[PDB]
Design an enzyme around this catalytic site. Structure first.
Site, PDB file in Angstrom:
ATOM      1  N   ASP B 189       8.378 -12.160  12.104  1.00  0.00           N
ATOM      2  CA  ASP B 189       6.991 -11.907  11.697  1.00  0.00           C
ATOM      3  C   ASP B 189       6.121 -12.223  12.878  1.00  0.00           C
ATOM      4  OD1 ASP B 189       4.306 -12.044  10.836  1.00  0.00           O
ATOM      5  OD2 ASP B 189       4.703 -13.599   9.291  1.00  0.00           O
ATOM      6  N   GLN B 192       0.784 -12.896  14.294  1.00  0.00           N
ATOM      7  CA  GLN B 192      -0.078 -13.687  15.113  1.00  0.00           C
ATOM      8  C   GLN B 192       0.265 -13.725  16.577  1.00  0.00           C
ATOM      9  OE1 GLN B 192      -3.008 -14.650  14.642  1.00  0.00           O
ATOM     10  NE2 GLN B 192      -2.892 -13.917  12.571  1.00  0.00           N
TER      11      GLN B 192
HETATM   12  C1  LIG Z   1      -2.238 -12.323   8.514  1.00  0.00           C
HETATM   13  N1  LIG Z   1      -3.077 -13.538   8.192  1.00  0.00           N
HETATM   14  C2  LIG Z   1      -4.557 -13.426   8.140  1.00  0.00           C
HETATM   15  C3  LIG Z   1      -5.095 -12.562   7.046  1.00  0.00           C
HETATM   16  C4  LIG Z   1      -5.152 -14.864   8.094  1.00  0.00           C
HETATM   17  O1  LIG Z   1      -4.265 -15.888   8.394  1.00  0.00           O
HETATM   18  O2  LIG Z   1      -6.257 -15.072   7.793  1.00  0.00           O
HETATM   19  C5  LIG Z   1      -0.666 -12.613   8.620  1.00  0.00           C
HETATM   20  C6  LIG Z   1       0.309 -11.965   7.866  1.00  0.00           C
HETATM   21  C7  LIG Z   1      -0.040 -10.801   6.993  1.00  0.00           C
HETATM   22  O3  LIG Z   1      -0.538  -9.740   7.870  1.00  0.00           O
HETATM   23  P1  LIG Z   1      -1.498  -8.632   7.106  1.00  0.00           P
HETATM   24  O4  LIG Z   1      -2.083  -7.729   8.098  1.00  0.00           O
HETATM   25  O5  LIG Z   1      -0.603  -8.041   6.122  1.00  0.00           O
HETATM   26  O6  LIG Z   1      -2.546  -9.196   6.165  1.00  0.00           O
HETATM   27  C8  LIG Z   1       1.640 -12.304   8.027  1.00  0.00           C
HETATM   28  N2  LIG Z   1       2.040 -13.319   8.805  1.00  0.00           N
HETATM   29  C9  LIG Z   1       1.094 -13.965   9.479  1.00  0.00           C
HETATM   30  C10 LIG Z   1       1.656 -15.091  10.348  1.00  0.00           C
HETATM   31  C11 LIG Z   1      -0.309 -13.649   9.413  1.00  0.00           C
HETATM   32  O7  LIG Z   1      -1.375 -14.325  10.099  1.00  0.00           O
END
Ligand SMILES: *[C@H](N[C@@H](C)C(=O)O)c1c(COP(=O)(O)O)cnc(C)c1O
Ligand SMILES: *[C@H](N[C@@H](C)C(=O)O)c1c(COP(=O)(O)O)cnc(C)c1O
Lengths: 401, 397
Positions: B189, B192
């Site tokens: 994943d 970030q």
């Molecule tokens: C996205 N996180 C942000 C919305 C936040 O932390 O405020 C994220 C996801 C999901 O990505 P999406 O584009 O689907 O919403 C998955 N893993 C991580 C580590 C993060 O930050």
């Protein structure tokens, strides 16, 4: 609502209309300037994520995303909570199969039409094959007219019925209100693929007796790409099982497990296509300023002329001869030429048309042809364009073969 | 030029101090102009038509897929477009769901964003699998010895590259070597990390990788990526099928086509893929090296300024392992309230649990306030932040 001249006033908002004759609206529509301006303002003036973060940008994005959901809900006659945003109609439909998978038992029956787009066929095939279901096709003719008597027999013991509002290949407008009433009397779940009806004609979920309904932003609604809709009637909130899960879909999570939140957020996993939803809402607002009734009327005139003109050229065209059951799509063939060649000649004269199977291969096999060439319209197309189209069709048709 | 030359392309930058980059990035003008060109000058569907608009759209869409492949060291055909990271991750779980047997083991970290946790929980629940977490500290540095122990019997390992709540950069290369060595499928994943630092699938040993265009890559919303290494093309069951996905179809059967079209059901987010490609191009003009150095400089100043103010911050003390995100808490004040007063001063920050409730429950806190950066953020912004932060803490007597 607004006093507009059709199609002149829509054409003023669409620069490509000065460059080509765009007759491939069933694949995707041209985009008006005010839809791109609504998306441009989210990107440049209030760019942020949603989920009500305290900061002003998130407040404004969230308020706009909620506004967009409500605009879409009103367009369809639905409740705010019954609207779920996807990428396209295809995602929406697959979500209905995956979300309802658990309620079928070996020996159950799904009925559809034999004219479906692959996206309203393949999910049901895969599901039938996997769970040992029966997938039965209601009967119809080569123009796309369904035998409604056969529909009553097929739906009788059906668990689910999935039908397209309009055929993307033939342009037939099925009698979905009647089919929905049958499904209701028989206790079958009714799903409508409204990918070619939305933004071209009226689509109302309560009029259609729909349990689920799906459509694509980029087509009739004049929205951007990457935004679809899935309507989930509230009756189903307790049975539909969200296929996508994660951020935004919960009340509580621990390492040992999770609890889902209420709809619609329950079905929307992760950051939604904020920009696309804003854009689609501007598309819908633009459509409602023109009026669905006037859009239908303008398409019917283009269909009437195109059709009368091809009869004069003795060029066979497909779909219903009754123009009341024929949407803004005219599939045709020039005997002696392959569809791809006709489309290529039409492209050298700046007329954009589609050729081939149209992701509706069962339509082409039923009829016993390889493809067709397809001209499709929208409110911005003109009778003048149709005349110039017929003019090149005329030249093209000279010579034997 | 850094960061002024980037700030010239983002009007919002003149209106607010945007420290909410982990939620989503701000979008540069050339990204929007690239998407506008498609909508106003070559608007058309893809797949295949002879007509010129469709030729152009098809060409730009393919070009985008290539730009994304190259960005992360993949092969054109190994890139799948989705709506976001959360969809990408869910698709990994659904498309591999068939390979598990009762008693099989999935391993992840305990700091996962809900999107990289729930699909695995659901899959473990429905299939009678063992879902286990590698151990770590409150910072949260992972115990790599414990990871060896845990990855040994694992069928699949899922880890985040960087935590959106702590800012911790995990040792993904190493975790990846372990899982390869142990025969486990490795899923990363990179939500970030993409656009903030290097992410290369070969170096990471990833089988699957996911990211979101709207974050670090400065792309638009609605466009995610899923990387599927060519090794898995015959195992991975496309969860979404229909248009553009087949070779042939009849009324009682279907044959699927080849990657990557096999995994993209229906009209794709053409405008988004093209916006994403232009964000990746904008990123590369700047350089990942410079982006990461600029952000590390903001973390370092931010962090020392909060030490000076007696404001505790979370995540690794070792700045080499700390991304461009600082979560903190003001003692005596709920984070939503810290975020409001900061907003009153035109500084945008996020507060709450950041969709990482297991992080909050491991630390024993409700939430945190989160200031996160990008390359266009400046040292002068961090100073103004620290000024209002100072006034805020003083006022609390
Ligand atoms: C996205 N996180 C942000 C919305 C936040 O932390 O405020 C994220 C996801 C999901 O990505 P999406 O584009 O689907 O919403 C998955 N893993 C991580 C580590 C993060 O930050
Ligand atoms: C869209 N069909 C067109 C791409 C075409 O024929 O040219 C369609 C779908 C799929 O919509 P997506 O937005 O998912 O591509 C589903 N049902 C129908 C009837 C149509 O036309």
């Amino acid at each position: 609502m607004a006093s507009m001249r059709i199609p002149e006033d829509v054409r003023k908002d669409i620069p490509l209309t000065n460059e080509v004759i765009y007759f491939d609206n069933t694949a995707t529509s041209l985009t008006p300037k005010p839809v791109v301006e609504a998306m441009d303002e989210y990107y440049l003036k209030y760019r942020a994520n949603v989920h009500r973060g305290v900061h002003r940008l998130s407040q404004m994005a969230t308020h706009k995303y909620e506004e967009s959901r409500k605009i879409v809900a009103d367009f369809i006659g639905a409740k705010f909570e019954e609207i779920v945003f996807t990428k396209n109609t295809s995602e929406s439909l697959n979500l209905v199969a995956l979300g309802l998978g658990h309620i079928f038992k070996r020996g159950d029956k799904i009925v559809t039409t034999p004219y479906e787009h692959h996206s309203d066929l393949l999910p049901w095939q895969r599901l039938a094959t996997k769970l040992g279901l029966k997938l039965e096709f209601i009967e119809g003719d080569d123009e796309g007219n369904l035998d409604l008597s056969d529909a009553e027999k097929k739906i009788k013991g059906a668990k689910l019925v999935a039908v397209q509002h309009v055929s993307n290949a033939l342009g037939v407008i099925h009698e979905v209100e009647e089919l929905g009433k049958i499904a209701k009397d028989e206790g079958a779940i009714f799903v409508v693929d409204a990918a070619q009806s939305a933004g071209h004609m009226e689509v109302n979920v309560k009029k259609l007796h729909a349990d689920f309904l799906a459509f694509s932003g980029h087509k009739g609604p004049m929205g951007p790409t990457g935004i679809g809709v899935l309507y989930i009637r509230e009756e189903f909130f307790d049975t539909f099982e969200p296929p996508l899960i994660g951020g935004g879909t919960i009340e509580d999570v621990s390492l040992d497990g999770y609890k889902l939140t209420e709809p619609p957020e329950r079905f929307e996993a992760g950051t939604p296509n904020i920009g696309g939803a804003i854009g689609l809402a501007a598309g819908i607002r633009y459509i409602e300023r023109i009026g669905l009734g006037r859009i239908e009327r303008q398409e019917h005139k283009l269909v009437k002329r195109t059709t009368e003109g091809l009869d004069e050229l003795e060029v066979p065209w497909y779909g219903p001869r009754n123009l009341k059951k024929h949407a803004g799509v005219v599939s045709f063939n020039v005997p002696g030429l392959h569809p791809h060649d006709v489309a290529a000649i039409l492209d050298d004269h700046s007329i954009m048309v589609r050729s081939g199977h149209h992701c509706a291969l069962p339509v082409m096999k039923k009829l016993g042809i390889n493809g067709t060439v397809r001209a499709s319209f929208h409110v911005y197309n003109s009778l003048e364009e149709v005349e110039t189209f017929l003019g090149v069709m005329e030249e093209l048709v000279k010579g034997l073969k």
